[PDB]
């Protein structure tokens, strides 16, 4: 009947970012990226599983999560934190919810430790390692 | 109960952080 | 050596909710999308000509006064060209802020665009992407 | 000012664009 105009330039901008970045990525950033996606939905699975048993309407609680799990981090904890976005994404598809999640990707990204770029450089090339 | 996912939250990673670094 | 974990994320999680849309997206709204892409492409070409005649300072902008201003002239009596065109220049400067703190200026200029929409941009778009659908199929 | 000149060429660029479909 009548078209969300503002959810379909969301859908195009999103896609042209990514291919933006991924096309100016390094080959062995590339091969990050993979081992990021592979790492992303081994915990994916558990992840939803916790967020199912909230049962919960904002942006607030996912804001927190994220800059709890890299207050001393981890590889693990900055990837759980990583997909964690990524699924509050998949809810926020229309409207202001867009908004909301730029802002949650912006706390993720500003709080990373400094370390962040190696720590995950050897990390997930040991994930790439095992899946090829 | 936000903790109570926020520990779960952190007991993913570390399960996740402990498969790889051994790789 | 090292890599740009942001950059990659950033990668990561743009792929992901790009996807997350187009899933949720009504079959119409994906016929619309599909027909943004093609005149997206179609204003590309002059787009980037006025942009790089203009210098490298302009077609790579330090900052995102520049092209926020040019998004908000184009929305202010519109029509569904200024729109798309619009939309276009959003998506080239976010081609160009790719790293780091470029990802905030890129938020900056998408919340322009939305903002500063006309409230019949649902309908009109609806049907001026139908023409550009039917001329290409 | 830049400004005025590239959106003069933006909106120029637009309309043509809009004129090539508002009839199909």
Do not use: K
Request: aromatic share 6%; hydrophobic share 45%.
């Amino acid at each position: 009947d009548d078209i969300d105009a503002s959810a379909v330039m969301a859908a195009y901008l999103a896609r042209e970012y990514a291919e933006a970045v991924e096309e100016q990525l390094t080959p062995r950033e590339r091969d990050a990226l993979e081992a990021l996606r592979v790492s992303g939905e081994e915990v994916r699975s558990p992840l939803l599983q916790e967020l199912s048993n909230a049962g919960e309407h904002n942006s607030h609680i996912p804001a927190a999560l994220v800059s709890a799990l890299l207050e001393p981090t981890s590889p693990g904890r900055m990837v759980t934190a990583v997909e964690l976005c990524a699924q509050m994404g998949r809810l926020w598809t229309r409207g202001r919810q867009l908004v909301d999640f730029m802002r949650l990707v912006y706390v993720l990204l500003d709080r990373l430790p400094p370390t962040a770029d190696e720590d995950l450089g050897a990390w997930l090339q040991a994930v790439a390692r095992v899946h090829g | 109960w936000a903790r109570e996912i926020g520990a779960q939250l952190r007991r993913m990673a570390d399960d996740l952080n402990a498969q790889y670094e051994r790789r």
